[PDB]
């Protein structure tokens, strides 16, 4: 069945870590790209004066 | 001006780089301020006094225009019908001004250019005509061309920066929420010729970066400065919606 | 579709647009200003499939 | 409705309405409806600055005939979008139709 | 004395040991596994000084 | 332990509205208490 | 009490003690109680594979 004594190492162990979440020690990266507001066009710039 | 203040201790944590999008952003929020104010100058052609109507008692009338009573008309496709109907009534209103034909265009909601794109569905329009459906645009409606812009009801830049809703303390070119005619609540859209806004300008558009070393901070400014004011009213106009029986 | 390496997740910030002003002759810059809201968005990846 | 946006004053998911589906059980009274309200989702878009092309409308295939009932001689004035030769509808407003 | 770029805070991993046992023929591995327990210590950096 | 970022460095201002020159000097670095079974201490009984 | 170690059974502060500072008065005797001190300091220490 389940692999006996493989190695996680997500999980905290430690004396008082909770250690329930088994994704804790992996820290979150940097995604490829920021996220960036829509540009506004102007429309009146060719519409008058 | 808009400006921005990048702190060193904050820009090293960062892990990306934000200096080339905020230049971006500052320069675009000064040429909002020019659409805001041009298009509520619009307006304020259209909203001038009776006794101030016009440049020469008899060139001209701003001319105002109905298109429902906004309950009636809540059904989208109806809605579009009486915008066509009434666009119609725009190009006479102005042309009864001498207004040369051409040059002229239309500037409304994208929620009312939804609405003639309704009306001129196979379901409702018995033959094809104007908007293209594939592309979801209609094209040149009369001598207006129609323009779609998000940002009406909105005006110049003011004395202070408003937080998300709030209102600027001193606006110069301002949208009236509840004036007389042609106000913030009751407007579709506002139909124009090419001499009826101008704007003056001095100084261009300039960007300019500082160091804040007391405060161990980079700066980013960006600044203009132009006037805007309406001339030739006869050339304005308005759609709005049929105030509310009291 | 972007991609990354050796991360539980990824991170995206967002940029929130900005307000102009008039700056009166001798008003400061530091006086009126607001700055630029940020904020993230979160794309944890899933296990192994 | 706490969370909707990013930033306030960014936009809307817009999750629109149709009808009650009691009395939309017949697909070209559907299909109506869908491209009516394919209209308005084009101008919420365009409300929030989204850029306009490179935009899609996922949907089940039933709805997908529902739009070429909808088109068909018997309910539309005039032709347009759809083809009956091979019944593929072609890009209802700015949006594509993927079955 | 350890350097990190443009980081909130620097996550130490560590490592807690392994104890070796007689594998007489005929034995699987898998059958004898403990494996190796980890936790983790973040120190995270202060404001300017 | 400690961790540094940017190290240390110093920089010089011209503060033209006082006719004067500001010099400062800055780090940002943070400390910490990894491997607490190598620490001790000696204390005074109560 | 709880969290002191890294991981169960890897080590402690071991905290220790000097015997108060009132009874302990001249500098010279001082030395006594820290030194003899340091014995289990260093044997304390050395039980952690430091």
């Known amino acids: 069945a389940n692999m006996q004594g493989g190695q996680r190492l997500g999980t905290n162990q430690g004396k008082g870590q909770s250690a329930a979440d088994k994704l804790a020690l992996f820290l ?11 540009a506004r066009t102007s429309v009146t710039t060719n519409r008058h004066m | 001006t808009a400006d921005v203040l990048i702190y060193d201790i904050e820009d090293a944590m960062n892990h990306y780089d934000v ?37 020469i008692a008899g060139l001209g009338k701003p001319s105002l225009l109905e298109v429902g009573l906004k309950a009636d008309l809540t059904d989208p496709v109806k809605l579009g019908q009486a915008v066509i109907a009434q666009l119609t009534i725009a190009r006479a209103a102005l042309t009864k001004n001498y207004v ?45 061309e129609v323009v779609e812009v998000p940002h009406l009801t909105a005006g110049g830049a003011g004395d202070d920066r408003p937080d998300e809703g709030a209102e600027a303390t001193n606006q110069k070119h301002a949208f009236p929420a509840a004036g007389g005619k042609v106000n913030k609540e009751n407007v579709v859209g506002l139909f124009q010729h090419r001499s009826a806004v101008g704007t003056v300008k001095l100084k261009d558009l300039a960007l300019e970066r500082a160091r804040r070393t007391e405060y161990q901070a980079d700066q980013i400014v960006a600044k203009y400065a132009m006037g805007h004011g309406g001339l030739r009213p006869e050339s304005a106009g308005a759609l709005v919606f049929t105030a509310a029986s009291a | 579709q972007r991609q990354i390496s050796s991360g539980k997740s990824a991170q995206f910030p967002v940029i929130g647009r900005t307000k102009a002003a008039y700056l009166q002759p001798g008003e400061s810059l530091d006086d009126k200003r607001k700055d630029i809201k940020h904020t993230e968005k979160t794309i944890n990846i899933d296990g192994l499939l």
């Open chain 1, 28 to 38: 979150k990266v940097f995604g490829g790209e920021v996220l960036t507001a829509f």
């Open chain 2, 19 to 55: 200096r080339s999008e905020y230049t971006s952003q500052i320069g675009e929020s000064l040429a909002m301020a020019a659409d805001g104010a041009v298009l509520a100058e619009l307006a304020g052609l259209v909203n001038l006094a009776d006794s101030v109507n016009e440049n």
């Open chain 2, 100 to 144: 040369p034909a051409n040059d002229r265009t239309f500037y409304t909601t994208p929620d009312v250019y939804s609405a003639i794109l309704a009306a001129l569905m196979p379901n409702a329009a018995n033959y094809a005509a104007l908007i293209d459906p594939e592309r979801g645009s209609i094209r040149n409606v009369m001598g207006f």
